[model samples]
Every structure is written in C-alpha cells, then in structure tokens.
Target chain A: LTCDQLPKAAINPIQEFIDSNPLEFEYVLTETFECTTRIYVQPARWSTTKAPTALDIKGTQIMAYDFVGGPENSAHLNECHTGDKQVWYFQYTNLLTDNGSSYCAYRCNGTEIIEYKCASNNNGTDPLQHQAMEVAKTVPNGDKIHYAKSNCPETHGCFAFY
Target chain B: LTCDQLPKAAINPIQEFIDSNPLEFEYVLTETFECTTRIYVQPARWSTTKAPTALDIKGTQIMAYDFVGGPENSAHLNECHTGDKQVWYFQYTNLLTDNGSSYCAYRCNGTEIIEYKCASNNNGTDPLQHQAMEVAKTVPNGDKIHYAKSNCPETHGCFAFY
Candidate 1:
C-alpha cells in the first residue's frame, strides 16, 4: 500500500520520524520482546565521518535473541576490531542483514540507513559496501506516528539497535 | 554475503561505539512520531541477583504494538514463580493466543534456549514462563548495552505486550 493509502492516524508520525531535521534527539531504533525493551541509536549526523559497527557489548542477533539459545549458551554479539581499522557500533534490534546474506547489519547517516551483518566478528568489511536503504521516500511535516507496520511484507531482519 | 562483501562508510561508528569503553553515555533511542516521542527503559542488568522477568515496566509484542492490534491494547508481561523452579514464557503476540495454543514461552538456560509449551500455569505460569524471555543481554566491561530485535521467525504472528 502507498502512504497515500495509510490510515490517517499513522501518516504524520511516520513522516516526521523519517525527516524531522534539527531534531532535538538523535534518531533511535527500538524493538522489544517479552516484557523488557531494548533500544539502539547513533548520531544521524555525528562529528566524526564514520559509521558504527562492532559493539563493546555482547549483542543479540536480529530476531536472534538469547531466548533462542540457552541463557548459558544463547546466540550473542561480540566486539571485534577485525584488526581492520573499520569499526562502528549501534544496537541490534531486528536487523535486515539483506545486503547479501539472509540478513545484513545496518546503521544510518542523514536521511539514509546503511547495512552490516553478523551480530559480531565481522571480517572487518566496510559498511559502505552495502546499499543505503530509505526509511521513507516522501514525507510531509506532520506529527502522528504511522508505523511502517502498515504492511511491510510483515517482516524485518536487520541487526541494529535503537 | 560476507562482511568481506559489505560496502564501506558505516564502519567507524560501529567500531567506535564498542571501543569507547567506559564511555560516559548511554545512547538513547528516539523517533519523531507526531506530538510525542514516547520512551521507556530500565537496566535489564540490575543489582538484583534475580534474573529479569516480569518487566520493570510494560512491554509491547514483537510487532503487535503496530500490527494485529492497536497500540492501546498491546498485551502485557509480568514475572511469575511457577513454583516448579523451572520457567519459560511462550509467545502470545499478534495472536494473543493463536501462535499455536496453550502457551509457548521460552528462556535461555545454557548453550540452549529452552521452550516450555502449553504446559504449566504457575498461576504465574502466565508470567513465570514469560519471565525467561529477555530484553537485553551481557554488557561490556564498562556500562554499555546490547539491545536486540533478536531473530524472530521471518513470519511473526503479532499479539502480546501493550
């Protein structure tokens, strides 16, 4: 369905969330499971000219949570320098590691979002190698949340957090 | 398919966030959806030796907050002491029950995340089982986070959380 066809309630929120410039807060990504909530965020426009990858913390795989593995041995994320200078960090909500694998990790810069895969131990490849995904193309200056759940194949698979 | 193929650009940020150990900041997640940018969080890793279950606050289903049902009706979560000492929560998202029936909750125990099907109802069975599902995982040497939109099946059924 097109934005034109979205329920009047969601249009504004979805739009503003996408293109609200000079935003008071940096763009954040969030997704929750069970009763707890976790978020991932990064500077939409950071001072340094760099994207985030590798996490200092052990992260859960997109859709891949500790829930799947035993708490003693659940799937996890790692902070890998890969000995390669390319490094970055962000949250791992529902990652759409689709750049090439069944999924790819992602991050955002300006109006565009980027990708990376593997919750951890990335061979230290540059994220720029992936495509820049758009949160939404056209947006109007409104203030209502139009969650993309409108009908997004009803599925997502990225590994970044809010 | 491998990081070996990912593009460049998003590397530094992903890396820096992880290496910036003892980083004095806790990244916040934000989205400009209309009038309010609702936000909620708590240290899933708290001082308590107790495992986190029954949220410190309310949580929304995987995608149920936006789909299946409206935001106002998202399901809910709570910690339960099933009595048996064993625990795990099944899914009720977008379906509220349809995931299959009874209760199909889960929890990570060892290198194996276990599942407890429509089985016990600690009374808290409703919660005891649910408590196993986690919101976050291990932290970095310093205070940091690893939020996850963990691996959920490509196909989600909604329901759960509110």
Candidate 2:
C-alpha cells in the first residue's frame, strides 16, 4: 500500500516484516526480464582533451531462467519445464568501453520462481567522461557502497560480480 | 511627601487635607483665592538677519530673577518658571542706537513663571543706499519691532496668556 494509505499502527508491522524478511522482492516475478544496463568508465579526472575512446571501460552479457514446476509433476512434464522453464537474455551492442558498464541486476527469492536477465553497456563519452569516472570509482570505495552494504543485505553482486 | 511614599486609600484623606492647606497656616490665609495677572512679553522666534540691532536677540540681558528665582530654582518650576528665571541683559555695544528703553514681561502660576525682555539698537548701513534709484528703498517697514508685543493680547503677553 502507498505510504498515505497505511495507518499509523501499520508502521511497526511493516518494519517488522522487512526486518524478518531479509530478502528484497522484485515486482515482476512471473515474467522474463531482459534489459540493457548502461555503465560509465573514466580516469580520476577524465578531461575532454584526452582521447575519447582511450578511457577505461567494459561491458557484459546476462542470462537467467527459472522453472515454474518441479520435475515430479507429470502433467507439467516437459523438457523445458524440468528446471529452466523460462529463460531471459540480454546483450550489449556497440559497447562504449571507455566508460564503465551500465547494467542492472535481476534478482528473486527462492520460493517464488522467476527468470531475470540484464546486459551491461558503457555509455561514457568525452563530455561525460569525468562524471563517469567518478561514478565508477565510487562503487567499491565510495560511501554509497558502504551504505548499500549496511542497508540492503539481501541483494548481492556488484557490476563486475556476474 | 514623595510620590512613591504617597499612602494608599486608607491614608489619602489626610494627605488631601495637608495638600489643600499651606504648611504655615499662621503666616498665610487658610481660604484659597484665585488671581489673574497680565504678562507683557512672551517667548518668540527672533532673526538677527532682518535687524542685527534687534535688542531681544540672543545674549541680551534678561533679568529673569526679578520675575522668579533664577536658574537656581529652575528645577522646582515648570517651563514657565524656567523661562521667567533665565534673563537676557542687553548691552547696546554691538550696533545701532543703544539708548532705547525696553520692558520685560512674565507669566506666573502658583507653581511656576516665565519672563521675556525687549530692547533694540542700531539698524546698521542700509543695503538700499548703494542700490540704483529704481531699486533703492528704505529698510523694510517691519524690520525691527518689539518681539514681546508681536503676539501679545492688548494687556497680557502672547504665548504667556495662552
């Protein structure tokens, strides 16, 4: 429910639920997810005078799937239904590797079977190289990284993890 | 009694009696009486530019003590008393004829009094004397006059009467 719709008493209940359930849930659990994630790469101070494509960068592909039914279900018995009943795929074309990869991670809970996929593409350019560099440098060493680790424990995997 | 030392309603009747009667009953009459007196002069705005010989101008001798006790008793009196006590004496040395006689006037209420003196001197060299015949004229008719009588009633002085 929206924040306004929740009664005052619901605050404690919602907080308790989030505290008890460590995992983060995505909305599209039943559908296959595939999308391109943009990433930026650069040096400490990426100036426009520097070579546009010479900056640091990278990209990657992501593929995932989940089976809706167990193998013992005879009526649901099918080759694709064994385990990977659904499949999702993502690909990055014309990757601008000068900047870090732009990508999103697909996630799910174990009980609610869902297939998710995401692709990474570097979208950095000369004008935005400096900004991209700062963003990339922030991942592991930045406050955002520490904040994410402390606030969101359920989700795992960084940009380069998968 | 001092204002602060005045007693509350319980003692007001006695205080009123003391206020109505003079402290020295033997020397002064017990009955209250009203008197009206005429003051010939009043405070006025004087300009030396018009007639430098104006006797009543600043620094002129004013025998205010004759009307009331001089500055020594100023604190015990009102504006009328202060005005009367401070006198301006005229010494005809500055300019014009030093021979004119003048009268001083004063207002006196039971508590305070004020005084003003009048006198005149030379009219100085006439500016119109050197001017061309067309513009040459006698000094303005209203140039010098008694400052006290300007605003006075037929017998009583100006602001003093008010």
Candidate 3:
C-alpha cells in the first residue's frame, strides 16, 4: 500500500518544522544472533509531528496483533521490565509502495522530531521498529546499533497507538 | 476441486459397487474438553457389487503430509514408543483441505486403506495433521481396546512397526 493510502493515525496534530533533514538514531549491540524482531511507537499525544517513538523502555507495554504466545495470554503484551534490560534493534529493508512525496513525517510523544526523504528508502523488504534499551541487550558488545524494524504496514499513517 | 475431479485412490477395488450405491458420511461430535472435536466417515467402503471391504486398513500413516504440518507444526504426528498405549484422537476440524473427491486417507504399513471425505477445501490453509495422544496410562483403564464412535473417522489403515 502507498503512504497516501495508509489510514491516518487516530490522532492528528500539527507541529513546527526544525530544519527539514533526514534523521538517524542508534542503539548498542553486545552480541550477534539470529532473530526476527520489530519496533512500534506509542505516542503520548496523538497530534504531534514527532519522530516515531521507540517502545523498548522499561514499563512500556508492547502488544502483538496476530501471533501465538507460548504460555501467556492471547495477544500477549510484553512489558519492558527493568530486570530484562532489553534493547531495541531495527533494520529497514525497503519501501513497498510510494506515493510521490518528497518526505514523510511521523510523530511520537507529541514531538515532530524527525523527517526522511524518499531517497532514504532502504529498498529492503522489511520495515523496522525497536526501542533503545532493547538494542543494547540484543547487539554485540562494542557493536554499533543501527535502525529499528517494525511490522506495521507503512500504509498505516500513524505509528503510535492510543 | 470437486469430487468428480478428485484423484482416484490408487486402489479402488470396489469401484463398480461404490458407483452404484454411494454413501454419505456426516460429522458427529467425539471427545470434547478443551478443544471442539468432530469426525466424519463413510460407514462402509466403496464397493461395486459386494460389500465394501473395511477401508484398506493398510497404508495410512498418521501425520505424514507437508500441508498437514503447515507453517507451524501445531498439528504433528504423535511420537510414541513401542508397546506404549496411547489414545489416538481424531477430529474433523483437523482436516484442513478436502479438495473435491480427494478425501483424507489413512495409511497403515505403507498402504492406503481408509479415507474420510472432509467437509471443506483447505487451499492455502493448514492441513489437518494428527494431534497429541492421551496415553493409556492417562486413561482410566484399557488395553488394546477397540472403540469406534461415529464421531471418529474410520481407520482406513493401520500398521505395527517393529
């Protein structure tokens, strides 16, 4: 689906522009392993144009849409407990469909913090999402953390949840 | 796929009789606890003139098809040790695909013996593989007992491997 076709997030708020430029964030990695993970953002306020927030902080509740839980409740929401000390890691694959737009904006916590141009599209197949701490625990020691991956379809306008 | 388009069983010994007087099987409730269960089977084998022989009772192996395994091996073949008594439970819901006339056939000793005409098609759906078994020790009391309920699909075939 194209970005234009994505359903708007439940909340819509305008924000000021801060020198429109592509942004990048990093997380730490301590080890290497094979895994399939994603990240999601839940904005504190719906209307702000902010960077997609990471959901890997302690006390955060991450709920899965369609998947099986080994021993817990259905649609299990995992808490990023301090004891777990998990870090978020994300890797952008590629954009699926594009709607001729110069740049797209995302929001998290009522902040219009980041912007990306069409040229930034990784051309990879997978989307990314992750929290910072999760990346710390997942990456190899001394390894640089990269982008976060998300399963959320790009066509969905808002990345944050109510 | 339709019944008319189903691949003929490699061995339809009583084809003529089955064509003359076809039988229809319906699903009946079998064991019900945590899971809903049902089974359907043609009471007699397909025959031309003589009484249909009990389903071949030779080639059907429980849980041995790829589709039956599906994306996740949720439904899988039961692994039991020799001499271990386990209650083989069957459910109609497990039959994911019923491509036309291609009924679910059971195998015993590498031979197709019994078959069940599933109610629906399982294209792109999970194949109904054998589920876990209730060990004889778990049951109240029983030894080599033969209990057939309308709810249980008839055995097309069975085998005892040394």
Candidate 4:
C-alpha cells in the first residue's frame, strides 16, 4: 500500500488529529493510578475542518478518541450510572445553527471539562447524554466511555443517549 | 440447572465475595489516580483468604478497574502520561519472597489507595501487574476485583510484569 496508491488516504479523523487531543488519563502513584479520558469525534465530520477545541474552565483539554464506545458496548450505557461512580459520556447535537459541532467531554473530578469537537450538521443544544463515571473493577480510568459521535442532534441526530 | 445444583461458581470467584464484603465504588477527588496496580501471584496460590482493602491516603476511595493498556487502547496510556496528566500502569512478579498474598489495587487522585486482596499460597511480595487509571465500556460495582487475585510469589509465582 504505497502512499499515493493507497485507497484515497483513509479518513482517520481521530488519528489525523493525534487521536483525541483533549484527553484525560491518570495512573495514580500511591496505590496505583491511571486514567485516560478521550473523545471520538463525529467520524462523518472527518471531512470537516477539525473544530477548535478548548479547555473547560476546570483545566480540561482535548486528548483524543478511541473506537468511540464500540457498538457492542452501547448495551451497558445506562449501567454507567449504576455504581458509586456516576461516569458520563455524550455524543452531542450542535444546538448552534451554523456551528455543527458537538463533543463527548469528560469532567475530571469536576475540575475540568475536556472535549472533542466535531459534528455533521446543526441541531438542538448538546445535552449530557452519554457518560458514566467509575469502574466495575478497581483502577483509575473512567468507565463506559463511548464518545463515538456523529452528526448534530438536529440534522443528523446525536449519539447522546447514554 | 437447579439453584443449589449449579456448579457453585463456574468461574465468578470475585462476585461471591461482594457476592463475601467491603464493596461499593466512587470516584474520589484528588491527584492520586491511576489504573490498577496489579501484582500477580502464583495461579496455584490463587487461594489466599482475600486480604482486606482500604482507600488511598487522601481519602480517595477505590474507583475501579479497566482493561489496562488493552491492545485496543494503549495509545491512551502514554497520553495519560502526557500534558497535565501523569498516568502509569504495570504488571509485576513479586520478587519478594515469603510475603505472599498479592493485591491488584487502585489509587484515587494522588492520595487514597484502594486495593483488592487475594492469594493462593505463599512466597514473594506483590508486584504491580494490571491496571488502567479509569473508565471505559465497563460493568458496575468495583468489588472483589482480582485485578480478585490468586496465591503467593515465591512457591507458586507472582504475576508482576507490565
């Protein structure tokens, strides 16, 4: 697969932008630690210019993306709120008419809000739809993070149900 | 199969423990956060009395576990170590002998230390093996996380080596 002959240079929205830029990860030192917060932008919006990402007042920054909560993982969404950790994840719908971008942001210790900026079309205001905090086992990272997003909630719909 | 006729616990040893004590989950606030710091004991030693667990110093309670460095997401690990966040994960083999009973623990923020104690026989000390600081597509409850361990290090062996 030579560079030029490749299949039209695959549209890897995540990787092209260093996976998810505004990311969160931690491996605590004492007992042990590790936490990685990420957001998979709307892949369909890959063609769109990467939206400008910013850190929520709490010091959050855009890390990057994963498979965006693989399909098989969706079934466990609501369960994200089952444990002591109220983990949250979302695929927003850009409520902003022209700004067709939403994010799956992670609020670290409620101190910062890191997000991924991407969207297909316009829609309703982005709501906190997809997210769950905490782990099923014992580790540091957050859980049930399926930020895999898509078009705006208004135009193409959003993945902000979990 | 009849309720009593079931195979006791085909493979869910950890469940019976909550399924035994010391349970619940929470995302403690602090810098002391990390993936599970696991120490693998001899699989044969996978039968200790299940050591008691405690929270990290900073009042940071046990958060939970994740597929630390899952081949599918190692990218997030290193990134965990980047920017304002510092993440770490490791697997070890107890080089300390006679100090059996290993644990797969977690750190909340930079203080609290939440650990899962379990082992089979006796031998070396617990070495860090498994852990990812935070979240994912996950399950509920962070009880009896072997991350629920097995035996000792010396006689049987340790599971330390991340």
Q: Write the per-residue lDDT of candidate 3 for residues A1-162, one digit (tens) a residue.
A: 222222222222111111111111122221121011122222211113222222211111221111112221111222212211111111221222341101222211121111111111222211232322232223222133333332222211111110
Ranking by lDDT: 4, 1, 3, 2
TM-score of chain B of each: 0.17, 0.17, 0.18, 0.19
TM-score for predicted model 3 compared with the true structure: 0.19
Residue-wise C-alpha lDDT for candidate 3, range B27-144, written one tens digit per residue:
1112221111111111111112212111111111111111112121122222111211111112223321233212222211112112232222221123331111112112222122
Q: In terms of TM-score, which candidate is strongest?
A: 3
lDDT of 1: 0.20
**C-alpha lDDT (0 to 100) for residue A124 of candidate 2:** 24
Q: State the weakest 10-residue window (summed lDDT) of model 4 chain B.
A: B38-47
Q: Which one wins on lDDT?
A: 4
User: Which of the two, 3 or 4, has more DockQ?
Assistant: 3
Q: Go through the candidates in order and give each one's C-alpha lDDT.
A: 0.20, 0.18, 0.20, 0.21
TM of each candidate vs. truth = 0.16, 0.13, 0.19, 0.17
Candidate with better lDDT, 3 vs 4: 4
Q: Looking at model 1 chain A, which ten-residue stretch has the lowest summed lDDT?
A: A17-26
DockQ each: 0.03, 0.00, 0.02, 0.01
* CAPRI tier for the interface of model 4: incorrect
Please give, for residues B67-158, the per-residue lDDT of candidate 1 as tens digits: 11113222122212111233332232111221211122223344333322222211112342233222221211111211122222221211
Which ranges of candidate 2 are over 4 A from the true structure? A1-82, A91-96, A103-116, A119-151, A154-162, B1-162
